[PDB]
């Protein structure tokens, strides 16, 4: 591995992507957590936090957050990004039976 690209593990010349769910001393930055978060149903009770404080939030905890420009959303720190291609392909094949 290398400190430059902290998102790859080379096992016998095979690249194993590490998910970006938690920062490390070298890799620590705003990016190393982005995969962990996801959007969910809006809840106005949860707090509004800073981008830097994202590191401190608990797993499975909701939080509101300003995103980009003129967008206020709700993020829940649970990684739910399944493969989209596989599901669509499988379902579409069934339509042909």
């Amino acid at each position: 591995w290398s400190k430059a690209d902290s998102s790859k593990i080379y096992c016998h010349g095979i690249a194993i992507r590490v998910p970006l769910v938690v920062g490390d001393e070298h890799m620590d930055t705003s990016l190393a957590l982005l995969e962990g978060f996801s959007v969910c149903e809006n809840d106005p009770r949860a707090p509004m936090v800073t981008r830097q404080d994202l590191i401190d939030v608990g797993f499975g905890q909701k939080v509101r957050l300003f995103v980009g420009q003129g967008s206020v959303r709700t993020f829940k720190r649970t990684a739910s990004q399944r493969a989209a291609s596989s599901d669509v392909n499988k379902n579409v094949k069934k339509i042909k039976m």
């Binding site: 399944r82 989209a84 599901d87 669509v88 499988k90 379902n91 579409v92």
Partner: peptide
């Protein structure tokens, strides 16, 4: 349609 597929989720 894509929602429906990703609704199923197998």
């Amino acid at each position: 349609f894509q929602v429906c597929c990703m609704f199923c989720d197998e």
